[PDB]
Amino acid sequence: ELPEDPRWELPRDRLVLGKPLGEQVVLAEAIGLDKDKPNRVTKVAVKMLKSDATEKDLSDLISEMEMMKMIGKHKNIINLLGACTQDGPLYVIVEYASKGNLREYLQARRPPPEEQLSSKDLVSCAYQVARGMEYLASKKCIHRDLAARNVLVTEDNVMKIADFGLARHIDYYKKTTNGRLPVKWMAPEALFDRIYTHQSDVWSFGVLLWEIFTLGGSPYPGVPVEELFKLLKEGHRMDKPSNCTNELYMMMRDCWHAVPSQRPTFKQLVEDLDRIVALTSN
Ligand SMILES: Cc1nc2ccc(-n3ncc(C(=O)c4cc5ccccc5[nH]4)c3N)cc2[nH]1
Numbered sequence: 001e002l003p004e005d006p007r008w009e010l011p012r013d014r015l016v017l018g019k020p021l022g023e024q025v026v027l028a029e030a031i032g033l034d035k036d037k038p039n040r041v042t043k044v045a046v047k048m049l050k051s052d053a054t055e056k057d058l059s060d061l062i063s064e065m066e067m068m069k070m071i072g073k074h075k076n077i078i079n080l081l082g083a084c085t086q087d088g089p090l091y092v093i094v095e096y097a098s099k100g101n102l103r104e105y106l107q108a109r110r111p112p113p114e115e116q117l118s119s120k121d122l123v124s125c126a127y128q129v130a131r132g133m134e135y136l137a138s139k140k141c142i143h144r145d146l147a148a149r150n151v152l153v154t155e156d157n158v159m160k161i162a163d164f165g166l167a168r169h170i171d172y173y174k175k176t177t178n179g180r181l182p183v184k185w186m187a188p189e190a191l192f193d194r195i196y197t198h199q200s201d202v203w204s205f206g207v208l209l210w211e212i213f214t215l216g217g218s219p220y221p222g223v224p225v226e227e228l229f230k231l232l233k234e235g236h237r238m239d240k241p242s243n244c245t246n247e248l249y250m251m252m253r254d255c256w257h258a259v260p261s262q263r264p265t266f267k268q269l270v271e272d273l274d275r276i277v278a279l280t281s282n
Contacts, residue, residue, distance in 0.1 A: 002062070002085040008069065010082040010093060015046065023177065024050050027096060033081060044081055047092040058090070060167045065092045067165040071139050076132030078152060078162045097152030097160055102129075103178075105153045106216035117215075119243070120282035126212050127273040128159035133205060134266035136164055137198045144168060144196050146204035147185045148211040149176065172225050181228070184219045188232045189260060199260035205269065206255025213241040213248065247276065 016029040028046045032038035047064075049057060068080035084091035099105055102125070109117050117125075129151055136143065143150075143164045152162045172183050187203035189195045207219055219238060220228055237256055240249040251272065257263045264272070 002090060004086055005069075005083070008080065008083045009086070010084055012084045012086070012088055012091075015044075015084060015091065015093070016041075017046065021045060022047075024048055028093075030082070030093065033093075042081075043096045043098070045078075045094050045096040047094065048089055061090055061092060063167045064165045065090075067141075068092075068094070071136070071141060071165070074132065074135040075158065076128050076160055077135060077164065078160050095154075095160065097162075098155040099153035099157070101162075102148035102151035102153055102159065103211065103216045106148065106212065110215045118282045120277065120280045122212055123248070123273065123277050123280045125159055126209055127270070127277050129161065129208060130205065130266055130269040130273050132159065132161035133201060134270050136161060137201070137266050141165075142196050142198060143201050143204070144190075145182065145185070146201050146208060147182070148208055148216065149178075151208070180218055181220075181225060183225060183228060184223075187260070188258070191229075191232070197260065198266070199263050202255050202263045202266065202269070203260075205266070206252045207238075209248065209252045209255065210238055210241060213244040217241070 010030065010033065014031045014033075016031070018027040018029065020026050022045075024047070026046045026048070028044050029041045030044045031041055033042045033044070034040070047061065049061060065080070065083060071077070073079050078097070079095045080093070081095060082093040084093070106117070108114060132151075133143070133146065141164055143161065145163065145166070146161070150161070150163045152160050154160065172181075175181055183191060185204045185207045187200035190197075190200040190203075210219060211217060220231070223231065235258060237253060240246075240252075251264075251269070254264050255269075
């Protein structure tokens with residue numbers, strides 16, 4: 001019983017549903033998504049409700065779609081493409097990232113495609129994520145769960161921020177699909193005082209920087225929740241990755257400032273990474 005929005009509405013028959021992607025998201029083919037090109041197909045990602053869908057789970061999908069409509073377009077985020085709101089279940093149509101999440105993408109390219117990423121490719125990857133986040137921050141949006149698992153990669157190797165429109169009950173002991181604790185990406189003030197800001201997202205970006213330069217490495221391996229809490233209270237910080245400059249590790253450390261006001265902004269991280277990209281050899 002959703003109202004139609006002709007800005008985004010795609011007839012249900014223009015969407016050829018395919019294989020599942022996300023754990024609910026499916027790969028699909030959209031015919032004539034762009035009005036100027038009606039005889040062309042576009043590979044898209046389709047988000048829809050599960051069988052045991054709650055009325056809150058439905059309201060959250062609507063909120064996510066309405067949020068995506070307002071945020072606007074940027075090259076380094078997953079963009080809204082359309083929606084099927086009439087005569088059936090709600091479908092939210094977004095951009096498809098063929099190469100999947102950043103963590104796997106980096107893991108697949110570790111030394112023994114599988115083609116080794118150069119140091120310029122690594123600094124460029126961080127620059128694109130910083131650019132996506134800078135855009136979201138300018139739109140007054142706080143991610144709250146920034147990590148390489150939530151950075152998706154396109155066929156053209158473009159980094160796009162994903163799952164930024166989430167409406168948030170947080171289980172600290174719950175592990176991800178690969179057995180990792182999300183609390184390892186949380187700023188201490190967000191973790192202990194539940195204070196989520198653009199500054200707490202910058203902290204998460206520091207952990208993401210560490211993920212990039214370890215090629216999908218797991219932060220704090222073998223550290224349980226209770227022991228992580230102790231490390232943070234003591235002011236413990238992760239070690240410099242192997243194959244990481246002192247400048248880029250200083251950047252990580254700045255992102256992890258105990259005082260949120262003293263951390264760099266995404267605007268500053270974009271300018272610094274723009275300069276480092278130009279001075280890094282491929
Ligand atoms: C704010 C927001 N709403 C969203 C709604 C859905 C998605 N979303 N979820 C998955 C995907 C893929 O492209 C995708 C998954 C996958 C797995 C293996 C190989 C290739 C792949 N591509 C996507 N775009 C991100 C969203 N961000």
